[PDB]
Amino acid sequence: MDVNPTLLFLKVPAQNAISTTFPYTGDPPYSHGTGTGYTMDTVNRTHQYSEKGKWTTNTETGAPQLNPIDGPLPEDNEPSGYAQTDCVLEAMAFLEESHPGIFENSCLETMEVVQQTRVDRLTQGRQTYDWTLNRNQPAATALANTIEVFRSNGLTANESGRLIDFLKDVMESMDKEEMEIRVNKRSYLIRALTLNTMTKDAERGKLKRRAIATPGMQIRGFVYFVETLARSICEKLEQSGLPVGGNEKKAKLANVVRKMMTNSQDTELSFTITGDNTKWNENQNPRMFLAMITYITKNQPEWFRNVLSIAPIMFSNKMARLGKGYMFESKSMKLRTQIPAEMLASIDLKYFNESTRKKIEKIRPLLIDGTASLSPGMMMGMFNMLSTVLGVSILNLGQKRYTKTTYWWDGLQSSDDFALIVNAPNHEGIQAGVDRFYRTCKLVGINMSKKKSYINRTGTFEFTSFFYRYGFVANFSMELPSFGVSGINESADMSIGVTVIKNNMINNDLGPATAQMALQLFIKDYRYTYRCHRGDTQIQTRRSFELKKLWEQTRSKAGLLVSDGGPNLYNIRNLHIPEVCLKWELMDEDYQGRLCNPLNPFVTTHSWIPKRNRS
């Protein structure tokens, strides 16, 4: 015999047995090293697809920066970020025609958030890169450090606490020549436009890393506004992929293939594409969003038309700090030397590797105080919710009111993935309807990949790991987070464990069987951690004796808590109830007397505060 699982696909189909392929071994691949050798690659590739554009030097920053917008048209099928400004607005204009007044209403719900927000809603975010210390810090301390700098000067209009008064300060700080931390005008701008790089780790579904970048402080407030606006705009739409998610997306995927599948003039083909756009971020240029933002904000007030307009101005002159650097060596003396990032602008080229010389060569011009400068593209991880509306406008062309021809389409779009559903009365009409989309989607700067895409008759396709057979929409959005202990306290972990399993059952598709078994592995990790094995178990540890003292001391043992002595009493019918309210009446008068004691000296008498140093 010679066992072979992937012969399983001869009887059972693929869309049902697809879970065999997901190896779930995507977490432990991490990044080994510093991670600058990749950031010198993304800067190069951003400048090879947009080389034809006229490049000029910028004022009060001293740096060249490319601009391929409105440039010539391509000839090769390779990627290209040569957009056309008279074409993008033409698409977003027709979006208003098919969807009346969608823009003027969406801005109104944002026109009040700008006046009804608070600065503290900013700090609830991911890690940031403060511009004072030149090191990644959390969102909590980076605000107190930068606001003290603003307070150090005469400007203290932040006292109102509104976020909009934090933006008036930075706007009133960027004009002063020298700042008092010392540092001049041309040295302070370069520090506020930075986007620190770092090699991406834990890539689930890719061979090699990606070299994402994290933003500063002043910039992350503006992008919160525009990201809010593109959320509402992409909420009222029908073919969205990013904001609509979870189990409700399971429904939207079947409505599209019901509308477009209605067979009038039943002599017509119906094909469906599964797609993936390559280099989605290397091509998009903020100069196009500035055309979009000022078109969304048509006839609106002036001050509100300004604030949203500011963020792409900063992305349009951005700069990416390089990593910690390289580490040379010598086998003779057997040492290692850590090179900084700035010295690469002065180090001799002969020590480096041959291909590492090819990177530094093309990047040798783009060097501003040990900091490269690029503006033909966007950085990974930054805002793209607005850039989903762009490709959606291409899905609007195809209602037969903009083609004036027999072929037509309509589809569904996440950021990097889509799916079209084409219709025409012969094979040849289909080959033209798709040849118009690959072309029309290139004038906007959104390339389509010809390796990660296939085509088939309708009834089955892929989209965002929501595999669709004729009527089955089995989803694999996110993997399982191990159902492990967190590490806060007794009563805290046991609440988090039996609610995450609840949410993963109604949001994702988690069966009734693999929710019980998951509750056996969680409690197995909860008892070993806190050493709370129940009495009748004959285990022995540094805590075991006193638990058996209480075990024999009580009458009805179903009332005790699991944290000390008691049994598990949950199932997949009552996960939405905390432990104490479940077995409250079940407890005897003795345990109940000592459990909820208002004179509890520890501090809910199980919830404590552990010893934390944060070394």
Binding site: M1, D2, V3, T6, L7, L10, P13, A14, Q15, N16, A17, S19, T20, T21, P23, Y24, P29, Y30, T59, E60, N67, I69, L73, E75, E90, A93, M171, M174, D175, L207, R287, K298, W303, N306, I313, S316, Y326, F328, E329, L335, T337, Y351, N353, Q431, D435, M448, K451, Y454, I455, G459, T460, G511, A513, T514, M517, A518, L521, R527, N568, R573
Partner: protein, 515 residues
């Protein structure tokens, strides 16, 4: 509220962020307001060349060619511990004696086998000094027999720092650090030896190592906790599926690994944080539960871990691993390429007929383990759940046809014949139980052999599948550029023998599905 004027400085930035034929913001803003659709898009297309097009290359039953595997020397084993060749000493003790401290449960377990020869070398390493291991097995043995003469009841024995335990770990085999201002004078510099890895071929031993995992055993190997009582119907549907599952996987050799790759990692992780500088002796211990209801406490081998000054998320600690086995290293040497082979004695034993008196070997070798290839071991029990999520969905696919509950699939001992094997001259089938072990072992091996290559093959060996399944169902499929997909698959087949195997399973699925 009032922002009627932006500034005089950043205003100069915005005029530097506009399209080419624009040199002002106010003169550009009103151009947008004055925009109306005059059919610009149909004009640009009339200038785009005809070399920008998507030609439907139709898929057919003769287009997909087989993947071309690497060619080169055969591969080697790179597992943290042994898989099929292991050998375990046991006490066979209800109310096993030690039972709280692995050391005394290990020393007490060692007194069963006797007849230990003097140590003896069998096959050198071919790269490194071999006698520096032979002086460790004697070193550990004297420190082990020392306990019975001491009888102090120690919890764990920090070994000695002899030269023999100073080299195979490499305490001071590292280079020195200095800045560039002092190093620039040196003229022997180099970035690093970052180059392309070596291409390895496919060997046979990994097929004879996966079959033996999808095979029954005698014991249970796992004991899970309890839950409440079920009253609803949706719960009985779960308790019926899960109970049919657990009674078809507990008697499996792959669950031995799930509970062997936990006790090893968690003790190595708990000790290596509380005792950094000093060495230690960590016995590989696995606690079983046999047929008769009789506990056991087995022992697979010892471990010796060196210095561990770990501060960041990805540090490294290295250890030596001593493992018992009978597999005479003279038939598959390329598998035991990195292993040092000793000889300890002869297990005087007789088969059902005749006698063997076969030898008993040891496999010593160093290793390395970050602080994440340990935490990826203690969560192997997640592997069971990932093998049940598959079986559950395969049942709820039939649910769209009829009731299709689990009852009509698990029994009916031979009613569907799931084809999970390729015997010569055919595809021999088996019941769902043999499936519910094969999905598990494939899932366990995906954690032991975790690597970036496997993450890339599955991402690109999935689209070639769906394109095939649309052909067999006759939905008239098509692709755009095929040879760009193969070349992005073969780029991930370098040296890992697991990935180098799945490209022999996939390559034998096309030949039987008529491509």
């Amino acid at each position: 509220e009032e922002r009627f004027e932006i500034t005089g400085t950043m205003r100069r930035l915005a005029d530097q962020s506009l399209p080419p034929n624009f040199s002002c913001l106010e003169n550009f803003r009103a151009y947008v307001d004055g925009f109306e659709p005059n059919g610009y898009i149909e004009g640009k297309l009339s200038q785009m060349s005809k070399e920008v097009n998507a030609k439907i290359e139709p898929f057919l039953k003769t287009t997909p060619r087989p993947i071309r595997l690497p060619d080169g020397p055969p591969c080697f084993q790179r597992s943290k511990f042994l898989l099929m060749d292991a050998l375990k000493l046991s006490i066979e003790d209800p109310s096993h004696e030690g039972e709280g401290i692995p050391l005394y449960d290990a020393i007490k377990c060692m007194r069963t086998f006797f007849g230990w020869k003097e140590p003896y070398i069998v096959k050198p390493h071919e790269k490194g000094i071999n006698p520096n291991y032979l002086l460790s097995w004697k070193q550990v043995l004297a420190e082990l027999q020392d306990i019975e003469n001491e009888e102090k009841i120690p919890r764990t024995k920090n070994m000695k720092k002899t030269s023999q335990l100073k080299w195979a770990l490499g305490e001071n085999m590292a280079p020195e650090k200095v800045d560039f201002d002092n190093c620039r004078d040196v003229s022997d510099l180099k970035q690093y030896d970052s180059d392309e890895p070596e291409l390895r071929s496919l060997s046979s031993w990994i097929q004879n190592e996966f079959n033996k995992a999808c095979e029954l055993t005698d014991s249970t190997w796992i004991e899970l906790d309890e839950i409440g009582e079920d009253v609803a119907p949706i719960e009985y549907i779960a308790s019926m599926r899960r109970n049919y599952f657990t009674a078809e996987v507990s008697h499996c050799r792959a669950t031995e690994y799930i509970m062997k790759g936990v006790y090893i990692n968690t003790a190595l992780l708990n000790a290596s944080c509380a005792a950094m500088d000093d060495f230690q002796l960590i016995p590989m211990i696995s606690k079983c539960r046999t047929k008769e209801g009789r506990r056991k406490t087995n022992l697979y081998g010892f471990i010796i871990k060196g210095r561990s000054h770990l501060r960041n998320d990805t540090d490294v600690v290295n250890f030596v691993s001593m493992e018992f086995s009978l597999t005479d290293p003279r038939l598959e040497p390329h598998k035991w390429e990195k292993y040092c082979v000793l000889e300890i004695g002869d297990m005087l034993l007789r088969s059902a007929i005749g006698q063997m008196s076969r030898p008993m070997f040891l496999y010593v070798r160093t290793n390395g383990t970050s602080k994440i290839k340990m935490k990826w071991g203690m969560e192997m029990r997640r592997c069971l759940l990932q093998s049940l999520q598959q079986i559950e969905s395969m049942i709820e696919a039939e649910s769209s046809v009829k009731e299709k509950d689990m009852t009509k699939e698990f029994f009916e001992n031979k009613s569907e014949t799931w084809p999970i094997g390729e015997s010569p001259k055919g595809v021999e089938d088996g019941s769902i139980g043999k499936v519910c072990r094969t999905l598990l072992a494939k899932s366990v091996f995906n954690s032991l052999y975790a690597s970036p290559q496997l993450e890339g093959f599955s991402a690109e060996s999935r689209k070639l599948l769906l394109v095939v399944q649309a052909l067999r169902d006759n939905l008239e499929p098509g692709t755009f550029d095929l040879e760009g997909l193969y070349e992005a698959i073969e780029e991930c087949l370098i040296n890992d023998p697991w990935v180098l195997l799945n490209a022999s399973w996939f390559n034998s699925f096309l030949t039987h599905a008529l491509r």
